[model samples]
Target: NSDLDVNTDIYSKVLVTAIYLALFVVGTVGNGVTLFTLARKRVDYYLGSLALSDLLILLFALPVELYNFIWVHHPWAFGDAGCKGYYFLRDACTYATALNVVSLSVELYLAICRTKKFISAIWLASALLAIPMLFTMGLQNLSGDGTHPGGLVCTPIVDTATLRVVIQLNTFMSFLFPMLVASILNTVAARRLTVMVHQAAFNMTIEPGRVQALRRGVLVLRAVVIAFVVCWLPYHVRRLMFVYISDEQWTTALFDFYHYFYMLSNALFYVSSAINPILYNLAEDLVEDWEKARKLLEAARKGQDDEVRILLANGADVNTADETGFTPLHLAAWEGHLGIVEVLLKNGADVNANDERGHTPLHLAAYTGHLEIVEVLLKNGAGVNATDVIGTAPLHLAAMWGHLEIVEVLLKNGADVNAQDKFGKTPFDLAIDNGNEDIAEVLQKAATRELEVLFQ
Candidate 1:
């Protein structure tokens, strides 16, 4: 008789080991092929940095997964180094992957939308890319010790409830919001590419290179957007349910399934990194399509559709104050045009882009008493504390002008109550100075134990 209980525990370990081996083999071969192809290509804009980033994440994570399986079989054989490295590197890879994807999206955004070359100039993009890596590594180092519970299986520092809140917040801000923006941009680029191509087919004056670039932009952007949503959605939704759902609602069977599902979801999350190369291969035509589209948009804008739509559609570049740094979105919000704002957003308008005056769409919306527009801009990620040239935020404008609804909305969205303007007046101070007692009271309560007070 075999001395090992192979069917129950050993079989599980064996299966996991087999799975890890398969993933490593396939993933390694695929990324290797991609690298080989990219190396031979004489492309002017090789996003080798992004490819290398994905490869490193996979290379780093494959070992940890294998080790976890190994430890399952020989639970007592690992040393301190194994324990620390297994935990720390696993966390580090997770952070790095997220950071890299975010960085790649930002780079794509600049290259496609800005129409500017050298945005990713060696020194510039490298310096910017290093920021997230540094931040993630720094944060992991700080919180690693706090994650240790009984010096095993590094977890979060806070209690489970608090940690859940933090995770949820991070998921929304770091993953969901960015992914949403990418999706919007991707859709707009794709549409713009389509329009441009159709026009070029008719005009024949359009340059083919512009069309190819736009098509590539669409493909790349769409792939990243889809991958991000598919990979991270399940994990975040599970976490969201965990945070909001009650314990009594969960049975042993349900909890067990949840755990299995979570692990599977995590497995799927990493699998996303492997899909980018496949996408690039499949959408190889996007390069040609994008260039055609770019030329069409330029031509169409010259005399194409209605002047407003064309201008606004192409105007992501026009009336854009590179000096004050205000985007067309800022002007739309200031003018209180709901339709125009929607059109701009649909055309890949950046609601968060600030102007030289330091004013965001939110500030303009508040100043103009466009409550719905203000809410839309904030919902779409406009900076709350974005002050104008004078250092006054949207909250200051709302309070100064006595727009109670705008003030309330800004406050609810975590606007700083005590944020002072250049002349040293805060939102509350403005409320007081204007003798708006009702608004002043709301600001006061917001600054104090508001959550506790409301809960009580």
Candidate 2:
């Protein structure tokens, strides 16, 4: 057969076989263990149900495909009824698991529904739709790579248009809409979740425990979406492309690419089922980190040094910024918490961290008249010359806000008195215009000393 379309590399074949075996071994065993683990935990029946659903895929479908691949250009010798039963089971459960997770996402968002209604409907509808799979798949004569007379295999038997329509609808509804809906839904949810994390939407003000529950949900939803897209999404493409080659152009390269694509996509399919157990457990830990980060930001904002310290000790991120782009250090300096400022800096909070407006903590320190905060910031090497969105530097803000002592400290620490703002106004000009005669004298003398040094 001149166009056999099979690889000659023996090692590659073995390696691929091993990976499939591993997917089966790991997938069933892990999903099997979780049947008990998910139930015993405080998780709902939904998760335990998914553990069973995912396990079924790895249990029946994986070995069937793996053995078929090994039978390698050989005919599927299993009887016609055998073919129909396996695929019927496969398609029905594929749709079942997909809808299971989709509904799981919706329910995870709001648990006000009867869970059994979702589960029964999800499985039954998939079972009805996949009834055609039994009729569509049977013992078709597989053009062989092994024997001279070719061989028989269980493959889908339908005319081109019908097959295209069947598979297109299958992949489209099975994964296309599901994946798209998840991405957009997660996008919307993530944006709102982050907004609430502007130190918690309730600001830990209204039933922090319930808020923590919602926080757990959205956090877990993101990881679920990510894994679904990465592992399961590619599982949809192979069939669509396989059918498309007939309507479009085909060649040896197309044949070769499709062969490799099939193997890789096949590998990814097993992984989609296998890797989810890891994600479920991973969700358990990461949710805490996200919660603590927002709470720590809140604690710092309200000037609770002890709360901030405890969060930091428990591994809260010191540099985690709020949605407004303000960090713990920025809030500390703004609220005149000199003590909080020291604790933050000691834990490596960035002294020059800018907010959305590019205003550094020093710029914040200067305007609020925390003269002692200003001194501490400058001593910690806060850039005296940092600017905000309008080219307003710390010295410019200090002078404009009438912090005379801060003005003197900034000038000593090399705050550029001569730097003009977006308004073409320098600190000296701001002092002159704002009626701060004391600051004007300071900038005036500061400019005078600079000029005298340059001239000499």
Candidate 3:
């Protein structure tokens, strides 16, 4: 008697090809629009912050789209280098995008709550944002050693259950932590905005125009928060499901559905980067100041003495914010434009002006992890303790991302060692979670006051 058997092939050639074509078109158009908008007017602070994120998503998706288009039906034509490169790029982009969203969500909290934002905060955020990407990329590159005997499916080293646990731990830190942050941040913003609207409505003495402005601000804040949640939830959930379920349980049909769902989710996630402009458009008045400043900066570069340029030089409101409530200083810090930062500071820019998000120049600097800019801001009296709407300090930002030197500098300058962000996390928490032994060591020394205590 013949044995009854079940056979199935997941990801049919036609389906895969169709998925590739759709993503190729969508990614190309989406990324193109994102790049164009950034280049055309020079994005507002928040939008500029997301530019790296958009680039990361496009970077990851493009190759997958291309490979599916060119080689899905054919045998593996690329060499080991090609295979390695593809995986490396894809992993890097995926991790970076996820981190970017987490960072942005935190920023959204500050904007909504009107906290005291620092200039170096962005640098801190950017550095912290990079931790997951770097860690994941390193692990994948090191562990993916052709586990599949046919040399087709290179998987990470899961030789034993112990290795799988280690991998899962890493995943929790890099991927799970970010998603958790995004979730909590979105929840906080939603709750805070509701309270704010109620408070505003109860104030019968407040002017109608002021009330309307406050309402609009709340709306924009909610939009940004919702945008983040909508983009990343599906992708992350799909990843977690794949992690727990065994291969046998995920039948071919189930696998195909998940694969497609994940890809689609990924596409939606990239679109979040594009939506920053919408927020900017909605906050035009605050954004207009940035435009004026950009024009004056251009004039200065071209040696033209427009009234705005002269005004900026004379300290005539160089710190003035446009509609989004960001100073030119904030924009420069977000972009990592060292020269612009220098010029703005030299011309009497307010190093401490908080935008709608309550972030000062130091906050932006810290979020982006611009070490040089961080130093400059610190020297120029940028407040290390200035918490954004969410109460995150510069040191917290540095420690979270494992920027050892930056963390040290902030600590030496009297940044609160035990300071907790909105999430009740210290920099030490971040260092330990990321397995940053070097930074962890520094944190230990700092916590113990080793040399001083020893001498005592």
Candidate 4:
């Protein structure tokens, strides 16, 4: 048993050390780029708040992990003061990040769905949530001696029962609850946007550019919610498992597997700090030109319908290609410029023109949840089921993004409900994978109706 313990300790230490080292390097560089890039541009208030929390995790929490990696199996050389300070900072940063996810989700919902701004609640809630960490965590000498030779550990200093309660509470409050809240809020926000688009398609009361902005906002919200849930779920589940397991139940094999699994989950938890910049990049584009096409693209992006028409009327090419082979029509449709889209279509712009990514104007319109533009494109002979380079069709984009109204419209307009993408996933599969149960149900009903008609 003694030899087995030594071997297991060595294996666990090696694995944990490698994992922490990789996290420290990757997290530092990724967050460094995030802060540097966001610093140069004007960012929204919540973005700055998120960046600060991420930096706190890297600066305070990760260094402590690195310290532990270097001194695995050694005594606590940092003393009681260092131990208490380290745990306090780590717990506070953890609470702050969790609260940040909740707050950011609420902010996105209000901004996109209600067209309102409410950020004060986030600051108040974050401050309140972080207060408990200060009182709960500290250095405890496990050997029960003030000057113990070697058994000091940084954790919650409380009785066994109280500690167990705290652990369970923190697991729910810091991990499970926040994830559920973010996911539900994001889904509702997407649903609301879908309803707005459906209404706009009939009433034509909402501006195309505003609807486009809302769709993009919903997309970003989905990314943030998904990232938070994926990165934190494993760590919280591991903690719950530890809380319920007992020494009597532990076997050698189970112990080894648990340690290895814990290392992997902990690594994944730290990855959340470094993923925001990549998510932002996926939803935004950077233009790099200084000519008529550039101006036209800018006008389209800003939804300056009059300016776009004026430029086109003044001999600005209706089909001018940007640096990325995105024509002016692509820009207009992508930004939800419905009037400008109509004007371009009337002036002989190619509705079926492909971009560098093989995405036609119809693809952009559907992916962005622009129902009015989708209708316009379909009516003007744009392929109802056109596929991009990867065989992703307009229906695939609609389903993947949780745009129920767009999915309904496409199915009604002759789109193949069972059309599979390059990955062999139909729109129904994408909807199910995305957790859009309502959209999935709609697709199922549509498929049943089609089958009934075919048999009749």
Candidate 5:
């Protein structure tokens, strides 16, 4: 029985080590590719950040796991500082990866549903959240002897109550919260994308190529979310169970099984980091058929004038409309790409072309507060007071969005401040309704000036 027990233990350790090595190799390659690709392209920041976290885990965390069994049998050879440093880095990287996923989901939601630009708050927040792990994790001599003579372990400080609190907090912050947020946001984004596709199909304004591209983007996001949930859910559940279950509550056989299960769960957890780059590759393939338009649109949206110019020279159409009726000029103006806007305009792109919603390039520029783009469009004979289908003119959008500079430019360039939209709301009314006090005041002063001029 003793020999059999020893053999079982050795086999378990060997299996765990083998798995760790495999993860290290695969994760390193995948994350390396992710980093290299993102560096060469204009991808989302969260994707890059997630890849960095995965690389850190592959390089630092997996090696630690591979050597943990050896460390359990031998006296600690690495110094105290090394022990503490490893745990600090491991915990920090894990936390950062979780937060990065959350950020990605939120960014996707905003980009799809709200049409907002991605923010860097999640990166800053992730850094802040990881700071506490440094102080909480340290080297402990479990054998109660001098450092060289004792069995040293890198773990939390020797306070059961505090450790329990840390475990619960870590589980919630690193696993539960991120899982919930990502799931919810991804679901919402998927729904919004579906609705957009249906609307585009009904309107027949969007090409099937563009609609397929949008669907592919949503599919990528969904795969990432599902992968995260699958990888982390079991690991976190095991962690929570370990925290709450006392050693006395488990038989020896049960404890051994639990240990094996825990190792398996951890191996599964690492899969999340390794799978993202693969999903991205799949997504790229899905949209490859429309690569020309996709690449051109991506370049325009990201303000890559050189790429846009190259694509245009390679026979890309300047006035090609997406499902949303957005031309390259509209995308350029929306992103405040002044150079790209100029390039497109010089290439004979329509300056006053209305999208499906009847919004001209000037409307997009004014709403987003791109004063230079607005000026260029107006100079290129874009109608200053052009309205969308809803009768909301450029000045109204500028005032409602609180773009003081854009509102000033529009007003100065003879935008009708008092012109009512289809909703019978003027720019001043929109400014007041949206709580733009400064813009409301500006409009009020303009109205008073207009009255004085009329009397004169």
Candidate 6:
């Protein structure tokens, strides 16, 4: 036991512990003063908002994590009351943090717009989504009773299947969605600014010099986001350790500091979050798509055929849809407007998209007595067997509505004779029930499968 021991594994402790000593102070004080400055209200930069979340993380959440890691390390003596809030706050703030980063990038593309309502909304939604944490965090002993040898874990008591879904959804919400959100927005904004910059430089007006500086500014901001996400990969990527690290044998500080995958990443998360303010200080578009698609969707719905053509010509999508997910084609089917149907399909509208009721354009076409529209839908590859939420196929609608022509068209296109709706009514049964003997006869002849014998 000499003082000259040549250090077999001392470096590993430095990797994790050195961070805590630094992060506990630098991390805490860094965001700590950031909050102090933000409260001064001399600035309303949303980066100020980012810091508040950063401070909540350092002041409230990270310390509990360190305590659990460094000391008693077990059944969580704080019990159910203290058991859940700490973890949820840590995670929920993480949500707000990523959410803010994306918002900051949004401001980067667009600048200095401090609408507090949206900021508050981000914070609101972030914490609310983490509500699932409380239910799952009920403290528990693994053994049958409290006295058993197994250490208590502050985890979900028993509902594991739901927990798995929550955890996976958390991965998407925290790790993937926000990160890629920044990815697309920064690029799109940068691209928009790039086009603007080119116009300023050689095409039109605005000040070329400032535009150049702004482009340079925006490009570097874009690169900064890439770096920010890379730093947090440890936070997002810890779960994969279980696949490859469970038996990897990270064979501990003296008594308790057993270095493992989670702690390694956990320490990295603090640094990732703590370092965020400086990144926000360093760094940082599609809203109008609704306008383009709304006109495309609405113009077609209102029978403004000229508007639909020009809207598509002017860069509106051919299949622009509404809140109910109804495409321009479906909207056209409402009044049996056959003109826009051809223009829409010519511009590449899909004939088979479902609306709020899961009713495709083909169903509406068959039900509304539009023989031409039905032929166009079928010609453009609308499946004759397409079903709605109630499971009524095109043939069912055609037969029930007494559209003998549509029933014949659907039959020629190989409509299913055996398709059943929620009430188990087939196309033939629907035709017979609706007094459309012509439709019933067409469906009866088109029944090609072994199911053909059932139409007695």
* lDDT (Cα atoms) of all candidates against the true structure: 0.60, 0.74, 0.58, 0.70, 0.74, 0.69
The stretch of ten residues in a row with the least summed lDDT in candidate 3 is 1-10
Model 4 ranges off by over 4 Å? 1-19, 69-71, 114-128, 141-148, 199-207, 246-255, 283-456
**Candidate 3, position 165, lDDT:** 57
Q: Which stretches in model 2 have alpha-carbon errors above 4 Å?
A: 1-25, 32-52, 59-89, 96-128, 131-172, 175-269, 278-290, 310-315, 432-438, 451-456
TM-scores across all candidates? Answer: 0.45, 0.60, 0.44, 0.57, 0.59, 0.52
Q: Supply the global lDDT for candidate 5.
A: 0.74
RMSD of 3: 24.2
Per-residue lDDT of candidate 4, residues 277-313 (tens digit): 5654543332111234457777877888788777777
TM for candidate 1 is: 0.45
| Candidate 6 per-residue lDDT over residues 67-176, each given as its tens digit | 65544356466667667888678778878878877876676666411477788888889889888888877766555555543466566654546666676778788878
Per-residue lDDT of 1-456 in model 3, one digit per residue for the tens? 011111223454445456555655555566566557756761244454454445554555455544532334222345444444554554444455455556556765776672214323643554453343332321222213523222333233343344345445545654667767777877777677667546533432121222344445546655665665677567656656766776568776775577567556655755665554456457655445434555654443343335444657543446544444566677777777777778778877778776655678777777778888888888899998988767788777777776777787888888877777788877788778878788877877787784586789
TM-score of 2: 0.60
- Per-residue error for 419 in candidate 6, Å, reads 84
- lDDT score, candidate 4, position 329: 78
Q: Tell me the spans in candidate 5 whose CA falls farther than 4 Å from its real position.
A: 1-8, 40-44, 69-74, 114-124, 144-150, 205-211, 282-291, 294-321, 324-456
Backbone clash count, each prediction separately: 18, 1, 47, 0, 1, 0
RMSD of each: 23.6, 9.5, 24.2, 17.3, 14.6, 20.1
Clash total of candidate 1? 18
